[PDB]
């Protein structure tokens, strides 16, 4: 497995087209590059951090498709196990939730969550009523009305 591999001589171009493989724009790809090249001297396995940065940015950049179609959340993580040579699906979400510790307080990730409007998976207007303890919050039991209209057009 590539997650087991230790002390990899990273060049820039390989993580450039690793970021370019997942439809990420140029700005967040350069921020992931600059985020790696500061912490690179103290990394046990750099693929842990690179996979965590790539996935934790692509659930924010492609969150609008993620809220509509759920199975892409089952899909794109499976595009890790095909190319990272890993048969374990718990290891890659472990990579996500262990880069989440190192990424949360930083300014560029802050600005990414502003500009794509994603705050632990939901919108700002959802989380301001989740934190306030509102009874009138949109409980996730109903199907979405946009999804209802999508299925109505699927019939049509």
């Amino acid at each position: 497995s590539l997650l087991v591999k230790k002390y990899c001589k990273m060049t820039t171009e390989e993580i450039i087209r690793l970021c370019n493989d997942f439809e990420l724009p140029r700005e967040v790809a350069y921020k992931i590059v600059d985020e790696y090249n500061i912490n690179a001297s103290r990394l046990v396995c750099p693929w842990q951090l690179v996979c965590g940065l790539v996935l934790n940015c692509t659930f924010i950049v492609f969150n609008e498709r993620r809220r509509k179609d759920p199975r892409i959340d089952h899909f794109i993580v499976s595009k890790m196990c095909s190319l990272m040579l890993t048969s374990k699906v718990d290891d890659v979400i472990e990579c996500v939730k262990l880069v989440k510790e190192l990424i949360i307080g930083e300014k560029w990730f802050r600005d990414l969550q502003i500009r794509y409007d994603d705050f632990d998976g939901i919108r700002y207007d959802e989380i301001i009523f989740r934190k306030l303890g509102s009874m009138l919050q949109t409980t996730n039991i109903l199907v979405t009305d946009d999804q209802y209209n999508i299925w109505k057009k699927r019939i049509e």
Binding site: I127, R130, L136, I141, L142
Partner: protein, 544 residues
Amino acid sequence: ADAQRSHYTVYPSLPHIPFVKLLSGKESEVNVEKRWELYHQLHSHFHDQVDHIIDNIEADLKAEISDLLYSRCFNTIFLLGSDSTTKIELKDESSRYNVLIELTPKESPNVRMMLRRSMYKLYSAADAEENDVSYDLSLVENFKRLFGKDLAMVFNFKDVDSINFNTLDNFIILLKSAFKYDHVKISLIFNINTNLSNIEKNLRQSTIRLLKRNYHKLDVSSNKGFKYGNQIFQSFLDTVDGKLNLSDRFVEFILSKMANNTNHNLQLLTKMLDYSLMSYFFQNAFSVFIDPVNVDFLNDDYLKILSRCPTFMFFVEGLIKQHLEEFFVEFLVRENPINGHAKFVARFLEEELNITNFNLIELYHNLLIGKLDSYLDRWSACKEYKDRLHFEPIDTIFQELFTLDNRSGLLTQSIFPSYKSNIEDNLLSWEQVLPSLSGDLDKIMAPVLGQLFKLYREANMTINIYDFYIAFRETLPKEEILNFIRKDPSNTKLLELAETPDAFDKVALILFMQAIFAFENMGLIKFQSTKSYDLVEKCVWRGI
């Protein structure tokens, strides 16, 4: 100023229902009135049965205390799980005064105070039942000469797990001296919430041998055989039946939260059930249709949000793959007999089989999830009724508007929040709490508490406060601070302090000292030395 007082009364200058308009502000006021009234009938119907159950709890506990009390040594009663609120009453028996003397650890600083309060209570009761005396045990010696009657003393030691055990031991040895009087009998009641062995190893062995001559044990706690919880939840099932059904995740939430509380889990259960009912009648606009006479009050919004059900999804997908208002109003008559089946298997379970140590909430959870057979495959006495007591739940259509479910995370924010986790998450991910709308400064620089917390989280044992202030400066931008500090020409002191060449460091030190003492008030940071104020220690860590 009122801000500098300790306490002050304000009468506000005045110039009717807390429920709001639902359906994006399109709900009629009559539906608001019906929601308020119908919530009040459900709430009153629940709490009437809750009140009768509570009075039954005190009545039965008083009955068993009176039974254990009246059928040359102490009569000792050890009440396990007491959490003492019982008002113990005694007999009105002729030729013998029965006096109940209650003692708390606050009333027990030493043996002398315990004896003095006991003799004062004894003389007060014996004067009220029918010259001054000394408040010592000789009043017990001369009781027949002053009142003509025998003495029966019952000592109620409230909260024995808080009393000093040497003082209690010496008071019991003091009370042993009254055994040489023929007119005196003494009962002791110990209210225990830890264990018997805990008090057994904090008393001397001679006192333990003294108490062993006549002692009884009795369990007091609210989880005694679950029968007082099992009533209250069934009372909720006697209130909501035919109206809403409980979700399985809500029931296992009840199970987990009641497993976390020892002394008071009945009132926690009542509080969670009440708050779920409040949340339902405050959030859903369909709660007017719980009353079966409001079925003519359907509008376009009601049918528009009615069609967005997973059950209605599956039903219309099945009917499309095979080959609205009248379909809705006729399907509101079914009774959902899971509550009646749960009550039936409960009365079957302690009717003849004599199985009484069950939780009805566990039974209802396993009946909801369809794993009832795995629940009653534990007792090994009800093997003959695996088809008599078998039930299959029926997933009805559009029941998700008429339900009590825990999926929005509202109960775990309002009743049991992750308090310190919420504090540190709002400190660290502040963009979440604050809107993202000093126009050029608010986009660039964080609030000072959040930036200071992000620099605080990434530090060691001891933080040097000067270097930490330098680390706080390097995050701030000088240029737009100097631009925004000159954006108010009315205050000239701010402009002349901005003209000074050391303006930025000074302003950063203002913000840093204000935010540091904010963290010191909140408890995140600590000065280890009373003087100097040159170093700090972190107190709290995120995610613990």
